[PDB]
Symmetry: D2
């Protein structure tokens, strides 16, 4: 099989330097362009998505939309899941990134940003950056919705959708496109490449450049992953 991952580009809150996580923030004007370049890179580099999987965060959805518009496969099937969602930022959701570096001091800030398993404190159900009871998460077990998270966790929850849902399509021969977020794609790629806990910290999945994994029946790489634009992914 063939799989193509795509991280949205800059978002409205990303240029204001605010932590996003699950707040359904829009895709910046720049993020719509990096979207189109991914589309164009799909068309150009001849990767052809038979089905699409996004998260339930609009910045991700808007990316696939614009990208598929440019590759002319706007008509392919569409599934969404909270399991493809970005990591939840807890208390840190909607807090100024730089204003938070000063309150926590470089070490606590960084463990929260790039550690595999330490989550920011949970958010209040009353917060304005809380999704407790959001309409797009109304048919999911209220008990499983996080109020914070870490890479570790994000993966504990993404895996089951990958195992059952996104895998039928792959083993069905189909070519799957996933348009999700930064933490969730690094999380998928870790499961995929076998990277250690210690190691996943060093992986950057460059925004707007689709990454193609050609997999075998056991859903493990055939050959090593290729970005559709090398020098761009490496620069």
């Amino acid at each position: 099989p063939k799989l193509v991952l795509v991280r949205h580009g800059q978002s409205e809150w990303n240029e204001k330097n605010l932590f996003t996580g699950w707040v359904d923030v829009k895709l910046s004007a720049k993020g719509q362009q990096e979207a189109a370049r991914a589309g164009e890179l799909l068309k150009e580099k001849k990767v052809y998505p038979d089905v699409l999987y996004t998260s339930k965060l609009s910045r991700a959805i808007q990316t696939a939309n614009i990208a598929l518009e440019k590759a002319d496969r706007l008509w392919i099937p569409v599934n969404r899941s909270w399991r493809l969602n970005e990591r939840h930022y807890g208390d840190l959701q909607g807090k100024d990134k730089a204003e938070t570096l000063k309150k926590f001091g470089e070490e606590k800030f960084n463990t929260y940003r790039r550690s595999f398993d330490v989550p920011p404190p949970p958010i209040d159900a009353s917060s304005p950056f809380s999704q407790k009871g959001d309409e797009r998460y109304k048919y999911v077990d209220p008990n499983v919705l996080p109020e914070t998270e870490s890479l570790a966790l994000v993966i504990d929850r993404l895996l089951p959708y990958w195992q059952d849902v996104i895998a039928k399509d792959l083993l069905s021969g189909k070519t799957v496109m996933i348009a999700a977020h930064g933490n969730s794609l690094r999380g998928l790629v870790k499961h995929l490449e076998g990277i250690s806990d210690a190691d996943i910290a060093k992986l950057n999945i460059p925004t707007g450049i689709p990454l193609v994994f050609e997999l075998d029946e056991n859903l493990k790489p055939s050959k090593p992953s290729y970005y559709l634009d090398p020098e761009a992914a490496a620069a």
Copy 2:
């Protein structure tokens, strides 16, 4: 139950004077401005789509993606079916509307455009504007795929989707938005409103404006449809 219909705005061929039908033509910059204006009226008028049904045509899918972006409901689930497609135009696909008028005359021209039962002529199997074999219709019975169509025919193939798929949702208390084409929606409004086989021709659906139908437990209008902007609709 609440239903919302959205006719996609202009396309690249609406500018060129070319009969489109099923050719997968794109929204023009103007079409996009229209799609957006529709999503805004959904937002502003507090009409909240729980689910989405488009056609397999991009210009329709583009309209959905733009409109629900301005409505912030870009997350609602979405299903697609060739049965929401616009009327297949047969031979007349990939051709000039003005040249077609200089050829067949006013009468045969109107007939190809607005007759209920009279379909344009069948398109040659191996033509540059035929969708026979399109990747997007590869899991449908090959024999049911139209070489041409008439509003009559269009409705014969739309009704079943409405009856089993769109209704499952409407009857689950969901608000369904449909984004399709002029004739497929012409088709469905006829069915919903009991409009005559003679009177359907005179109905047009303003592009970029959401027709909201407030249906009862028998999927029949409990009161007349209202566009979320009836003045720009006059």
Copy 3:
């Protein structure tokens, strides 16, 4: 592609000599056995269903359940649909066929029973043998549901499910088993082979014997349909 068709054995009404149509009548002792016979024949001639389709009438559901148990293939995906139902018998629903022969006369009995396009009168909504408002049809447009039908009418509604739903599986390489009823299965074989309206009345499809169809890209049959027991079939 390959399609298996299974007509069910007698119901508890085909036994007391009654018209059933849409009455959710239970399969009879003689017919549950024909269901089992059906099962061993799928296993015997190595015909392997990867997905099952039935209708909403309990006599057809029961037949496949009892049959895939014998084929050792219980586990497969299952789809049920009113469109695969048996022809709605209208006013004849729940009436002794012999009393019905004298209540009408041979010509009007032959019509109501074997014509292609003249449906029996409609059954009143109040009548105890009406399915109007019955729960299993609650998510279907109230107006499409028949009050009486003809073989023609049955093909009209059968076809859309076959064209959109069944074809998708077939065209994806799956061997589809359909367990339903007489007219609906005949309505379907009329399509598959271009049988004329004039001749359709002649076609029988025995109960408890699987009609397999080897199809091609065009879902038109590749070679003559065959029963996995041509004797008890041609007998």
Copy 4:
């Protein structure tokens, strides 16, 4: 949200003294009798499932098929998953329970049968009792398909299907009937009522008796669960 749980009865193997686990052993005469009694009990107590969930093991699919044939709800939708399956018994599958005891001993046997987190040894794919590669699991990530299991692990693979799939229907408003096994249902019940890591062994789920739950908006019990036969249960 109303949920109904149905454990299946004695399989062919529960009489021959062998560990079954993931082996698709068919139900026997009494197994097929108790299922019909579960069905009669449902009709009687007026519990009408709106949709069905079963594992991918014949014994429980049969129970549902027999139980719902007896309830008159033969027609309700049917969904299936390997996550609803019975606990994998790894290298104890296909083996006799008494001879197992002669190899491991009281302690190590009581542990492989009743510890919450110690799985029996794994089984080599080569064995005629390993489901690795079985057709019914060809559309699930191969890597996740257990070659042994513990109740802890059963809950871990199960929860996500409950969370996303079972709950959608329960939250949609429907009455859900699950028909799985001892482990998966006890594993579910542990979660539903908060039964502790070291207290769950004591919980018996009678076979053939339907267990009903009445859940609130949080899919947490609204009242204490109840069997449609409080006599045959204890």
